[PDB]
């Protein structure tokens, strides 16, 4: 149905905008990317950079993953990101999100040959 690297791109890449254009960005994008299909995904981050720039994080600062694996990496530079978090007024299937646009470092887990992002761990 989907490989981990393609799922990462679907859930986390928005190379087509430099930032969230409106407070409704998350509401639109979490629907469009099919993150509201069977439940409201409670938190998600979109990265406004090229896939290459995000893949390159896999060779940057090695850091511990939240789950305790050691295959996580922190971006040297900040990156334009948009944090999407479910609101309290949100109830499936009417998923509602707060949109937060910021410059943060991203932390992703990388696997495979080629070594590519497969999980978005945090932004710092
Ligand atoms: N170091 C690592 N290396 C490889 N895979 C890793 C990993 N740490 C976690 N995972 C995988 O991800 C899920 C954990 O996620 P968590 O339990 O911590 O919360 P979650 O809501 O994200 O659940 P899922 O939307 O099902 O997970 P993903 O499909 O990978 O979406 P994701 O990339 O995380 O989006 P963001 O919300 O973070 O922005 C698990 O299935 C886990 O096996
Ligand atoms: N060890 C390394 N090995 C390989 N490539 C490396 C690297 N360090 C950086 N790069 C790459 O060179 C370009 C410039 O990066 P640079 O790191 O040289 O500029 P930068 O201005 O972006 O850094 P800093 O203000 O020093 O960062 P921090 O002080 O830690 O926090 P904060 O200021 O808030 O955020 P950011 O400013 O980073 O966005 C980037 O493309 C980056 O990927």
Author numbering: 1 to 124
Give sentences from the paper.
With the new chain-extended nucleoside oligophosphates in hand, we go on to investigate in detail their interaction with ribonuclease A, a model protein containing a polycationic active site and for which X-ray crystal structures are relatively straightforward to obtain.
Here, we demonstrate by extending adenosine monophosphate (AMP) and uridine monophosphate (UMP) to their corresponding nucleoside hexaphosphates, while adenosine diphosphate (ADP) and uridine diphosphate (UDP) are phosphate chain-extended to the corresponding nucleoside heptaphosphates. This result represents the first direct chemical syntheses of nucleoside-5′-hexa- and -heptaphosphates.
